[PDB]
């Protein structure tokens, strides 16, 4: 529109109808010039790594991006807990996205001063991946989404993506994306962008835990019409076979088992544990591609302990939260939110414990029976199993790879798997040039007006809702805020104005039947 | 054929804020987190794993290499089925060598 | 108890705020809160009109009734007016029952 008129307004709302939650949140950004207004090829050679299983080659891109791929960035803790408490299931429906009060700013260094004036004829310039031809990276637990109080003022992350490399070289099947061969449009301060995506059909997130578990979905008053063998010798094969009852539940004949598992090393969050030996890479779990290594995190979706042993968690089978305020590097157990998955224990095995045991010779009168710990068990018929919990701050979606095949997608880190994602939206700053020499010059222009950008950016997601039609009588389990007197509120500010996540909630409270 | 691998679909640039246990002894259980970011991206968490394999024995097409045993049959990776031995051919899709 | 009309839906409270203006980032992504911002502040006009209803005296009172009154004797300013710096001042609260009507 113009100069001083407004181009939108501060929408931040969640509204809640009968099977529905319409939730909208808008945030204050900022945007600088990323690179110099330049592509520059990156690789492990230019980090100074030399690990192989760390080596990879790429591109920095000039260009920034907006993420809310994170539950915090739509949901305030009191929805959060509204939605874990009241409903069994919830998945996307459809999004609206908007940019509005675009602020370009200019900055003049004269001596170790710097003066910030509006440039009013400068852009911006903004477009949506909705091809997908662009390599996507919202899928990977990144920082830089949209801040879970709507009073930070947050910066625009830098976009960049990786192709194939060997060591820190790249190869002729390698790709390089320039991201202004893309249409895109072009905002002055009186400009605005918008537009709407739809969510593909997914299933809805369990947020329920099972009240049985798939070893006691028996009646525990009536034989089985079945057999067991009981007996073996006399104390001669003496074949004896027993009715399987409620004394016996463990040999009972059932129809479905537990779903694969992929064993971790087991870790204690107990003080003054002696270990044996460093051990974190060196015990890892662990999956290779041509040739590098790679940890396995989180992996498949297992319970992180046995009943009664939270102290314990798989060493890389859990989402790791870092608290406020915490360090980037070599912080302490109390510095970090360790997540678990106790309840899918029901239908999953535990994270590290073996999945069974099973025969691995032919018993015979010289020799004995023998059996083998199954350490990692694939999908078999009539397997059953809960995915991944997701949380508050954790992902809510990620991009399903575009292979020729695929079981089960849903993303292995929590959330709602899809081939057609909600698309990247890529920003970048129009460089503009200082003053050119008098005479011509056929290179490139590398001198330009110190700038960077500001303005308002709403998102609006329906989400629908399953609700629950437990007949249970007991009453269930809720997340609920502890009345006993603290220094501070649980999620919110301090004395300092720091907003803070005490602690990751999950979405599984209600019970319902296996 | 992708111009992108698994392990190298994310963001070079940004740190992930999710964790991953470091260090474990103090030189004590002194467990330490660290930040997984583009420096280690090995122990990134991703959401998606390569696919199944069944692995066969590596040979060699350069000649004057010695082999230490005939092998074509003993060595073979294979599925059975009611007491027949089948040579597993050619198998699950997987890569034929590394880089 | 201090005096006026108590309503279950009074007037709203009406919040107004300087959006902030963040200061020149730095080139390199920091996942931070940015605590730099550009110092501002906003001016304008205000305008408030309230329509009162007036319940108007039928009293058949004879005897004049009091009402509230300057009074005329000289003083070194006016009341309810400002000094000779511009002060503009109240000098006494002023109530709002001097009619009478019966019991």
């Given at each position: 529109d113009g100069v001083g008129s407004s181009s939108g307004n501060w929408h931040c709302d969640s509204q809640w109808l009968g099977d529905r939650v319409i939730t909208t949140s808008t945030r204050t950004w900022a945007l600088p010039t990323y690179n110099n207004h330049l592509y520059k090829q990156i690789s492990n050679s230019t980090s100074g790594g030399s690990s192989n299983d760390n080596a990879y080659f790429g591109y920095s891109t000039p260009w920034g991006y907006f993420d809310f791929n994170r539950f915090h960035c739509h949901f305030s803790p009191r929805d959060w807990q509204r939605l874990i408490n009241n409903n069994w299931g919830f998945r996307p429906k459809r999004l609206n996205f908007k940019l509005f009060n675009i602020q370009v700013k200019e900055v003049t260094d004269n001596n170790g001063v710097k003066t910030i004036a509006n440039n009013l004829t400068s852009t911006v310039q903004v477009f949506t991946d909705s091809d997908y031809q662009l390599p996507y990276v919202?899928?990977?637990?990144?920082?830089?989404?949209?801040?879970?109080?709507?009073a930070d003022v947050f910066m625009i992350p830098q976009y960049g993506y990786l192709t194939l490399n060997d060591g820190s070289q790249a190869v002729g099947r390698s790709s390089f994306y320039c991201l202004e061969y893309f249409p895109s449009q072009m905002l002055r301060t009186g400009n605005n962008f918008q537009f709407s995506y739809e969510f593909e059909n997914v299933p809805f997130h369990s947020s329920y835990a099972h009240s049985q578990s798939l070893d006691r979905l028996?009646?525990?008053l009536i034989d089985q019409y079945l057999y067991y063998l009981s007996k073996t010798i006399n104390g001669q094969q003496t074949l004896k076979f027993s009715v399987a009852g409620p004394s016996n539940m463990a040999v009972q004949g059932r129809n479905y088992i537990p779903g694969p598992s992929y064993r971790q090393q087991r870790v204690s969050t107990t003080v003054t544990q002696a270990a044996a030996?460093?051990?974190?890479?060196?015990?890892a779990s662990s999956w290779a591609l041509n040739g590098r290594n790679s940890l396995m995190?989180?992996?498949?979706?297992?319970?992180?302990?046995?009943?009664?042993?939270?102290?314990f968690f798989p060493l890389s089978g859990s989402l790791i939260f870092g608290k406020q305020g915490t360090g980037r590097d070599n912080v302490d157990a109390d510095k970090v939110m360790i997540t678990n998955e106790e309840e899918i224990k029901t239908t999953n095995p535990v994270?590290?414990?073996?999945?069974g045991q099973v025969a691995t010779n032919h018993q015979s009168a010289q020799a004995q029976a023998q059996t083998g710990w199954v350490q990692n068990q694939g999908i078999l018929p009539g397997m059953v199993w809960q995915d991944r919990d997701v949380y508050l701050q954790g992902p809510i979606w990620a991009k399903i790879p575009h292979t020729d095949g695929n079981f089960h997608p849903s993303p292995l880190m929590g959330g709602f798997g899809m081939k057609h994602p909600p698309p990247q939206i890529l920003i970048k700053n129009t460089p503009v040039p200082a003053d050119p020499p008098t005479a011509f010059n056929k290179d490139k222009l590398n001198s330009f007006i110190t700038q960077y950008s500001t303005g308002q950016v709403s998102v609006e997601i329906e989400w629908e809702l399953q609700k629950e039609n437990s007949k249970r009588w007991n009453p269930e389990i809720q997340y609920t805020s502890n009345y006993y007197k603290s220094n501070n509120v649980e999620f919110a500010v301090n004395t300092e104005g720091v907003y803070s996540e005490p602690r990751p909630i999950g979405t599984r409270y209600l019970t319902r039947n296996l």
């Open positions: 919202l899928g990977s637990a990144h920082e830089g989404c949209l801040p879970p109080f709507p028996m009646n525990p030996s460093e051990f974190a890479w060196p015990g995190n989180p992996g498949p979706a297992m319970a992180s302990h046995k009943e009664g042993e939270d102290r994270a590290t414990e073996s999945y």
